[PDB]
Target: beta-lactoglobulin
Amino acid sequence: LIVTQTMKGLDIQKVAGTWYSLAMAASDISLLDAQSAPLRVYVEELKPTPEGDLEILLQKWENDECAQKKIIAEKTKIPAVFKIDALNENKVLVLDTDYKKYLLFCMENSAEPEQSLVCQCLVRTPEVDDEALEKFDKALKALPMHIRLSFNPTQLEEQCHI
Amino acid sequence: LIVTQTMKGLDIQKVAGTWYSLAMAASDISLLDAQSAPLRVYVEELKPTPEGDLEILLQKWENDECAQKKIIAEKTKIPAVFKIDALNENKVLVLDTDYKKYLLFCMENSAEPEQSLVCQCLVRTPEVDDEALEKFDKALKALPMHIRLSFNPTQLEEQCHI
Model:
């Protein structure tokens, strides 16, 4: 409840498939800082289960290898908000998406709002879509982001973006 | 700052080596519930770096395998409290330890105290030490724990305790 953009009428069945983390932004430099930074994760695929949940397939630099992890986000009463389990009460929010080109989403710990916000711009193809980045930035001006990363085509095709 | 027991005069150099998670307890059943539960981790070795930090070598059921993870807890101004990095502002506290037999410690998210407290009883050998369990329970009565797990010798020698 910091993110004032929520998508009306989300059909998670339609966000299924292949995705590229084109841009990232966080409210804290230390969350996206290095490759081994805690929330520096790359989305590979979004898989919605028939129950209504959302299996997230991402990549992250855990050790000194591009490890593949599988997170599952359970649906809540609100169709655009999902829950990820732990000691950390993290919510996932879908801000906007046309299903065919991009998807904007943020993640925040319910307890530490300002200290856990991380948002990304996901695109279908490994191209630099300017229109998507505009919408991403627009949704971002209202939030306290302090670091913004952007990736190029070549990097998008590499595991963990090199 | 919920845990009223802190160890005076901790020498982390002396807690180096092999350890067994003999008992676990959390304030929430859902943290220790299943094998795949978020904070159901098993300690293998504690390795203090010369800088003063503490490399933690544990095991956890992440996928459907007993995966080995390596967490590093950075020292703080207080010699018995350490910090683990993420969106979650987790502190590690050493409550008591004789260095030779046991070590009692708890973990808590600074933001969500009551909702993240997890404590364990670590012992040097894969035996059931009654004296350790007494001290563990004593330190535990003052806290809001809602689940308490205890392991047997046979399980202590298995990866992920079976």
Chain A touches chain B through 21 residues (CB under 8 Å).
